[PDB]
Design an enzyme around this catalytic site. Structure first.
Site, PDB file in Angstrom:
ATOM      1  N   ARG A   1       0.969  -1.045   0.100  1.00  0.00           N
ATOM      2  CA  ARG A   1      -0.061  -0.001   0.144  1.00  0.00           C
ATOM      3  C   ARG A   1       0.699   1.224   0.027  1.00  0.00           C
ATOM      4  NH1 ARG A   1      -4.266  -2.350   4.312  1.00  0.00           N
ATOM      5  NH2 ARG A   1      -2.073  -3.371   4.977  1.00  0.00           N
TER       6      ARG A   1
ATOM      7  N   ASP B   1      15.616   6.287  -7.547  1.00  0.00           N
ATOM      8  CA  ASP B   1      14.721   6.260  -6.096  1.00  0.00           C
ATOM      9  C   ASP B   1      15.302   5.105  -5.520  1.00  0.00           C
ATOM     10  OD1 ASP B   1      12.907   7.625  -4.334  1.00  0.00           O
ATOM     11  OD2 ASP B   1      11.193   6.294  -4.969  1.00  0.00           O
TER      12      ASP B   1
HETATM   13  O1  LIG Z   1       1.966   4.269  -5.050  1.00  0.00           O
HETATM   14  C1  LIG Z   1       2.722   3.551  -5.249  1.00  0.00           C
HETATM   15  N1  LIG Z   1       4.048   3.860  -5.594  1.00  0.00           N
HETATM   16  C2  LIG Z   1       4.410   5.096  -6.231  1.00  0.00           C
HETATM   17  C3  LIG Z   1       4.176   5.120  -7.753  1.00  0.00           C
HETATM   18  C4  LIG Z   1       3.125   5.673  -8.415  1.00  0.00           C
HETATM   19  C5  LIG Z   1       3.365   5.554  -9.595  1.00  0.00           C
HETATM   20  N2  LIG Z   1       3.926   4.595 -10.042  1.00  0.00           N
HETATM   21  N3  LIG Z   1       4.418   4.459  -8.519  1.00  0.00           N
HETATM   22  C6  LIG Z   1       2.656   2.079  -4.205  1.00  0.00           C
HETATM   23  C7  LIG Z   1       3.664   1.779  -3.602  1.00  0.00           C
HETATM   24  C8  LIG Z   1       3.815   0.482  -2.485  1.00  0.00           C
HETATM   25  C9  LIG Z   1       4.698   0.332  -1.856  1.00  0.00           C
HETATM   26  C10 LIG Z   1       5.110   1.074  -0.687  1.00  0.00           C
HETATM   27  C11 LIG Z   1       6.466   0.732  -0.091  1.00  0.00           C
HETATM   28  N4  LIG Z   1       7.495   0.412  -0.985  1.00  0.00           N
HETATM   29  C12 LIG Z   1       7.164  -0.686  -1.651  1.00  0.00           C
HETATM   30  C13 LIG Z   1       6.068  -0.272  -2.609  1.00  0.00           C
HETATM   31  C14 LIG Z   1       5.598  -1.537  -3.501  1.00  0.00           C
HETATM   32  O2  LIG Z   1       4.790  -2.815  -3.019  1.00  0.00           O
HETATM   33  C15 LIG Z   1       4.763  -3.760  -3.536  1.00  0.00           C
HETATM   34  C16 LIG Z   1       4.226  -4.801  -2.824  1.00  0.00           C
HETATM   35  C17 LIG Z   1       4.369  -6.206  -3.554  1.00  0.00           C
HETATM   36  C18 LIG Z   1       4.564  -6.626  -4.712  1.00  0.00           C
HETATM   37  C19 LIG Z   1       5.088  -5.268  -5.599  1.00  0.00           C
HETATM   38  C20 LIG Z   1       5.171  -4.232  -5.148  1.00  0.00           C
HETATM   39  O3  LIG Z   1       5.370  -5.670  -6.897  1.00  0.00           O
HETATM   40  C21 LIG Z   1       5.106  -7.225  -6.735  1.00  0.00           C
HETATM   41  O4  LIG Z   1       4.597  -7.620  -5.661  1.00  0.00           O
HETATM   42  C22 LIG Z   1       2.536  -0.128  -3.013  1.00  0.00           C
HETATM   43  C23 LIG Z   1       1.328   0.178  -3.628  1.00  0.00           C
HETATM   44  C24 LIG Z   1       1.554   1.419  -4.589  1.00  0.00           C
HETATM   45  F1  LIG Z   1       0.477   1.759  -5.313  1.00  0.00           F
END
Ligand SMILES: O=C(NCc1ccn[nH]1)c1cc([C@@H]2CCNC[C@H]2COc2ccc3c(c2)OCO3)ccc1F
Ligand SMILES: *N[C@@H](CS)C(=O)OC
Ligand SMILES: [Mg+2]
Lengths: 621, 60, 339
Positions: free
Chosen positions: A169, A287
């Site tokens: 999240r 990042d």
């Molecule tokens: O809003 C998020 N990221 C910023 C963004 C905006 C546009 N592209 N990226 C976001 C971030 C996270 C977490 C925040 C904490 N750091 C890790 C990150 C990613 O989480 C995961 C968690 C599980 C996963 C995965 C990613 O890829 C495969 O399985 C989860 C959901 C999200 F929507």
């Protein structure tokens, strides 16, 4: 569940592919499912081909052999069977130079992975051509088409997945763990909200992520969260990524506290190989921080969320982008370019945080970002005595303020980092194969693992996202290959042999397209009544099942072929001479494309041709 | 095409040197043929229905 | 200027021929036949309709039994019908869709057909094996095939849009004799009864009389204003009929070597697609792009009747050897048999 088309779809797909030149050996052999059906043909249906594929497969295994001792043994086993036996049998279609390359290298006990590479090329040589042509003549290329049709008609929704418990999240969305219903493959489904994106003005973030994902998600990289599909719903953007249900290093740095030199070294290696993957493809991550590194069930790690990354083959960027504690000096300098060097300073910063629990320039919990930025630029951080001298020369190398002095910048890239004394114990091959034992295995079914530290939309908004849906070919073909491919090829085989024994018994054996000048033939439907079609140079016949065609249209009478939309689906629109209309509906996106093409080619062609024939053109009345 | 308009002439010579007959006779010969055989022409002199495949003939 | 003196000897020789014929022009057939009783009111009716082809018919041909006929359609098919029952004897799907002509051998044994494939393809209807198979393909022409006719099972004359006709040997597959002469696409040919001679019409607006053996153009007949689409020998072998885009037919005599008659009418504006004589030669049947066939009094030029049957172009027709019936074949995909 995946149901394949019928072998009659060949006639349309073979043409579709030939237009794009994808019916060559290089393009088919180098695909996963293409390779597999080709292999099958050469192993089971053509006696000249089996020892070449057998040999091929044997080299490919030799290429993966871990230790030098395994190679010496396997290489002589390959020599005595596929070189010497073939040669004594007067049955070795390969060059002298090829023979003497391996024999030269063996007699000196040199057994590198690449030893057999001249034979890879000469095997390919003898497979492309006559063999390949018979392969195109066979059932297997028929089956390849049946498969490649299913691929070019992928349209996903939520109902193609089975969504399970949350696994992440962040600011813009939240990740879930799911199953793709038709294969039973486990994935993560990222679900970014459109309404939020607009609200925080991150269309550039969401967009850049998909372009960046696509640029990295081939090759099978163990250390990045790669993508197999992307798709849309009425108010969501969904990537389908590699499953990672083990939380992120920022959460784990909270529970475990700091790591040792030995423990951070594990995370170091797996991250370094991740960076190396993106820098070969001209992507800088930027990042890089612990919150962005994720963990699987086993405790191996991947790099995550590529919004703030960008392509640098074309134009080296200059803005300061990324988190404040871990950026490089040239990244923070305005009007200064940078390449892959941004990440190696970031690495150094992140790596310190794992060891000491803070960013090396954020001194006393200080939110003052412009103090963290002036310490980064003026201070060369002092390193505690605890730290080994092997750890220091690394962290010092990585945190040089000049790009001209930093590790991984002097020209050999990751290789300069890998060669550090800090990593001298490591075999990087075994890092890549994920063989080293991870420190923290996540607790089973843990709550809040990978979380973060956190108006409507017109047509005008969704015009951004209309070139979003994607399907990575390499990945879909892998998923299939490792789940259902075999059993479906055996199911579809029994199914096509029962309809053979049926259509023989009822009489209908002879095929209406043969011995004639039929251009193309396949199933379509007309208003909807489903019929079989045959397209000749001067007409479009069609039939119901168990008859011959008793109906047609002429190429003369077709006035134009347009594309119209009927009941939320795309259709062909033939305007007929004397104002009448014909509408055709198609079973797949490639079929629709090619019918539309081949009908237009045909009617323009015919009308032109007939004009020049006195006995056939129209005259005054 | 000097070779070609010379071939047209040598052809026209052939077309000219032929024994022609008077239209009067020609027509006389056609007309006399038509009357000669008009009783053998079913489109002019009908046959019985029983002998006509396309009216009333039963056995074939 | 050797090309000027040969271009002036041509216009001069042409006038020598005009004179030789204007001197034979002592009477007109119309004058000569002014006395004989008119033929009557010809009211032939549709006695069979033949359903089968899926698109335009372009061509047909009676077999000598006055019963089977072969027909060639846009649907890429030959049908061989038994006119007496409407039964199909054979349906022959073809290697080329673009078919334009067909022919039935005098013997019964083969049929032929051709088109934009530029090849006369012989089919065998009584193989040892009992299947209908292509027994030969006759390539040679450099343009479309527009008509062909058998002399016997081993010989066939063709006519092509390459502006030529040719007598073939079906065994050797080669052109025994080539008939060059026309300055424009050759649309139709007809054999004399004794088969030592044949005539051809062409889009140059002329018909030509050839010798089978000696292979040269004996006589050349002009007068039409526009493409000659069909041509047909009168039964005694001494004269032939033609049919043109100009909306006329014409009768030409061989020995008098000129036009004897013109069949036409100011109501009639569409062009002719086919011609055929009744058995005695007295009737001249003509097929038109106004969806009618017209029956003409060959002797008197009166229009004796109309067969009005099809809803598109009448494209072809023909009278049976025994004289009992006439068939029409149209762009409406139907053949009809009349008397
Ligand atoms: O809003 C998020 N990221 C910023 C963004 C905006 C546009 N592209 N990226 C976001 C971030 C996270 C977490 C925040 C904490 N750091 C890790 C990150 C990613 O989480 C995961 C968690 C599980 C996963 C995965 C990613 O890829 C495969 O399985 C989860 C959901 C999200 F929507
Ligand atoms: N109908 C029979 C003879 S009775 C025949 O052979 O065909 C006309
Ligand atoms: Mg900069």
């Amino acid at each position: 569940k995946i149901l394949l088309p019928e072998p009659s779809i060949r006639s349309v797909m073979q043409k579709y592919l030939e237009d794009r030149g994808e019916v060559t050996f290089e393009k088919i052999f180098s695909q996963k499912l293409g390779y597999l059906l080709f292999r099958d043909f050469c192993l089971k249906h053509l006696e000249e081909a089996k020892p070449l594929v057998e040999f091929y497969e044997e080299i490919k295994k030799y290429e993966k052999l871990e230790t030098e001792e395994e190679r010496l043994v396997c290489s002589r086993e390959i020599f005595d069977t596929y070189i010497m036996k073939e040669l004594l049998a007067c049955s070795h279609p390969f060059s002298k130079s090829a023979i003497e390359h391996v024999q030269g290298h063996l007699v000196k006990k040199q057994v590198p992975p690449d030893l057999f590479q001249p034979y890879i090329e000469e095997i390919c040589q003898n497979l492309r051509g006559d063999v390949f042509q018979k392969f195109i003549e066979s059932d297997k290329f028929t089956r390849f088409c049946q498969w490649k049709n299913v691929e070019l008609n992928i349209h996903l929704t939520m109902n193609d997945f089975s969504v399970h418990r949350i696994i992440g999240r962040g600011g813009f969305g939240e990740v879930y763990g799911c199953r793709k219903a038709d294969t039973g493959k486990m994935y993560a489904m990222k679900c970014l909200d459109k309404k939020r994106i607009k609200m925080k003005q991150g269309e550039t973030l969401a967009l850049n992520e998909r372009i960046m994902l696509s640029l990295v998600s081939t090759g099978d990289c163990p250390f990045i969260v790669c993508m197999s599909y992307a798709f849309h719903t009425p108010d969501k953007l969904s990537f389908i990524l590699d499953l990672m249900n083990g939380g992120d290093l920022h959460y784990h740095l909270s529970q475990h506290g700091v790591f040792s030199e030995a423990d951070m070294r594990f995370y170091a290696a797996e991250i370094i190989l991740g960076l190396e993957h993106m820098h070969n493809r001209f992507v800088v991550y930027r990042d890089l921080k612990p919150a962005n590194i994720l963990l699987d069930e086993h405790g191996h790690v991947r790099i995550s969320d590529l919004g703030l990354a960008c392509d640098f083959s074309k134009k080296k960027p200059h803005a300061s982008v990324g988190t404040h504690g871990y950026m490089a000096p040239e990244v923070l300098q305005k009007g200064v370019a940078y390449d892959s060097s941004a990440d190696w300073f970031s690495l150094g910063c992140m790596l310190f945080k794992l060891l000491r629990g803070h960013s090396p320039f954020r001194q006393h919990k200080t939110k003052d970002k412009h103090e963290i930025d002036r310490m980064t630029l003026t201070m060369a951080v002092e390193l505690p005595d605890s730290f080994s001298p092997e750890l220091r020369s690394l962290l010092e190398g990585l945190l040089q303020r000049d790009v001209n002095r930093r590790l991984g910048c002097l020209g050999r890239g990751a290789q300069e980092v890998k060669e550090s004394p800090f990593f001298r114990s490591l075999d990087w091959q075994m890092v890549f194969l994920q063989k080293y034992p991870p420190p923290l295995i996540p607790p089973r079914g843990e709550v809040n693992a990978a979380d973060a530290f956190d108006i409507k939309l017109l047509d005008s908004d969704q015009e951004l996202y209309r070139n979003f849906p994607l399907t990575i070919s390499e990945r879909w073909q892998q998923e299939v290959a490792e789940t259902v491919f075999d059993t479906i090829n055996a199911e579809t085989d029994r199914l096509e042999a029962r309809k053979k024994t049926k259509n023989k018994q009822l009489g209908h054996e002879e095929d209406y397209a043969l011995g004639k000048d039929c251009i193309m033939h396949g199933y379509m439907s007309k208003m909807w009544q489903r019929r079989y079609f045959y397209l000749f140079p001067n007409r479009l016949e069609w039939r119901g099942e168990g008859e011959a065609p008793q109906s047609l249209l002429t190429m003369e009478e077709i006035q134009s072929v347009e594309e119209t939309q009927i009941k939320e689906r795309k259709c062909l629109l033939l305007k007929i001479r004397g104002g009448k209309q014909f509408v055709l509906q198609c079973d797949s996106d490639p079929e629709l494309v090619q019918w539309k093409k081949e009908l237009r080619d045909a009617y323009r062609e015919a009308q032109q041709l007939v004009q020049r024939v006195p006995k056939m053109k129209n005259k005054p009345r | 095409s000097i070779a070609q308009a010379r071939k047209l002439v040598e052809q026209l010579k052939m077309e000219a040197n032929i024994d022609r007959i008077k239209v009067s006779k020609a027509a006389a010969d056609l007309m006399a043929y038509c009357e000669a055989h008009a009783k053998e022409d079913p489109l002019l002199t009908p046959v019985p229905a029983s002998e006509n495949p396309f009216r009333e003939k039963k056995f074939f | 200027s050797e090309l000027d003196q040969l271009r002036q000897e041509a216009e001069q020789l042409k006038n020598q021929i005009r004179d030789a014929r204007k001197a034979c022009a002592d009477a007109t057939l119309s004058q000569i036949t002014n006395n004989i009783d008119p033929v009557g009111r010809i009211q032939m009716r549709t006695r069979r309709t033949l359903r089968g082809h899926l698109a335009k018919i372009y061509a047909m041909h009676w077999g000598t039994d006055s019963r089977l006929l072969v027909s060639a359609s846009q649907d890429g098919k030959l049908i061989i019908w038994d006119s007496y029952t409407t039964n199909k004897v054979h349906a022959i799907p073809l290697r080329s869709s673009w078919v334009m002509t067909c022919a039935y051998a005098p013997s019964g044994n083969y049929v032929a057909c051709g088109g934009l494939d530029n090849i006369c393809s012989i089919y065998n209807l009584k193989t040892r094996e009992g299947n209908v198979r292509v027994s030969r393909e006759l390539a040679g022409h450099t343009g479309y095939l527009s008509c062909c006719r058998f002399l016997d099972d081993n010989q066939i004359v063709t006519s092509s849009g390459d502006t030529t006709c040719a007598l073939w040997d079906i065994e050797t597959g080669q052109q025994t004799t080539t008939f060059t002469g026309h300055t424009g696409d050759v649309m139709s040919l007809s054999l004399a009864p004794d088969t030592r001679l044949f005539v051809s019409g062409a889009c140059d607006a002329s018909a030509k009389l050839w010798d089978v053996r000696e292979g040269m153009c004996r006589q050349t007949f002009t007068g039409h204003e526009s493409d000659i689409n069909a041509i047909c020998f009168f039964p005694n072998g001494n004269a032939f009929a033609t049919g043109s885009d100009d909306a006329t037919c014409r009768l030409f005599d061989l020995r008098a070597d000129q036009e004897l008659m013109t069949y036409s009418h100011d109501n009639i504006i569409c062009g002719i697609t086919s011609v055929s004589f009744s058995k005695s030669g007295r009737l001249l049947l003509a097929g038109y792009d106004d969806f009618n066939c017209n029956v003409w009094d060959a002797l008197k030029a009166d229009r004796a009747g109309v067969l009005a049957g099809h809803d598109n172009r009448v494209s072809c027709l023909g009278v049976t050897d025994d004289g009992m019936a006439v068939a029409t074949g149209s762009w409406d995909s139907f053949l009809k048999i009349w008397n």
